[PDB]
Design a protein around this ligand. Sequence first.
Ligand SMILES: COc1cccc(-c2cccc([C@@]3(c4ccccc4)NC(=N)N(C)C3=O)c2)c1
Length: 390
Amino acid sequence: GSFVEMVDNLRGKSGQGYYVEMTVGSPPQTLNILVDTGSSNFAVGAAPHPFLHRYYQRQLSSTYRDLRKGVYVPYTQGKWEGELGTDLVSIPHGPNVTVRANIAAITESDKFFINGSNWEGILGLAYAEIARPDDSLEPFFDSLVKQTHVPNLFSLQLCGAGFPLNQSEVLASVGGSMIIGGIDHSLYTGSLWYTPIRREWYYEVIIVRVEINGQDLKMDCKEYNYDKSIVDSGTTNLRLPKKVFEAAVKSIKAASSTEKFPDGFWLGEQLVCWQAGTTPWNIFPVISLYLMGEVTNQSFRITILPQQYLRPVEDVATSQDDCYKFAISQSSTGTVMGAVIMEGFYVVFDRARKRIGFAVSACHVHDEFRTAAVEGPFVTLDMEDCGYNI
Ligand SMILES: COc1cccc(-c2cccc([C@@]3(c4ccccc4)NC(=N)N(C)C3=O)c2)c1
């Protein structure tokens, strides 16, 4: 481990988000910020909200600069709206630098903040193409790299506990690491395997084959990337395109057929519970996603366990049972490799070399019989055909 100052700098969980401490303004105002590889704005609560116990107070910062421009970000779930500006930003458990960055001061929101998440803003780590209102609003990471000697790369180790964490425990537990400017070898085992970043907007990748317990899902690979496949720390679930979801659920049901689960479970709505310590991990299949390699006609695979795709939840009766929700769901906007998938791996966002690396996480949850894996190479032909084009 060469980045001790940044190791263990994350807190949170897959259901509510993983966050890092940051400071904004002069004198510095401390805020907890969601690490989000699926968006490109640094947007912070800047007005009272029922779920915020603190927020950015621009009038108290001598370095605040008003850009005199509004920003409106509606989405299916809800929305956020605010005022654009710039200020001095630092990451206490990060590189020892202070940068001048764009900040969207959130003045109004609907279903954006989460009750008990302990974060007050989001750090959109993706590219300018998807920044709001447009690509002229330089994202935080672009500012950081341009203004300092920090290498153009970051890596994330998100650590799922493997069991529920109550309010007190989730505040006291280490949720993972965000290594800014490098790769820390203590965070993974085995080798790192890289997949190309297809295009710089979201962290877009190409899935070339899918297996459930080694059984090929056997769909046209374009289906797996319809209309895109992305790596998103800001999404809880593994989200799959409608047809892929239907095929994967049928195969997962068939593999786990010795136990019948209600439809509500497969829809990610209802929990399933087992007597303490008796979760039948072995009946559930492993899932392998093959990703395009850096070498022509070569792929590698990442394999996840049900310990990743079954999200631990506290029982309705706070009983002694071990309960979970199915953390694979359908999408109409392509595949999303969310937090539950990222929890199995140390993920390297190598922006400098336009590639994403995967290695087995030193903190992935497993059992005595199976582990997550990152393996290769595999001979795979016509992988460019797996990518979707509008
Ligand atoms: C595991 O990450 C989590 C868990 C729970 C909530 C959020 C969360 C909360 C608020 C926003 C987001 C968003 C978002 C970002 C910008 C604009 C609109 C939405 N970030 C993201 N990747 N997705 C899918 C969102 O909905 C994500 C993240």
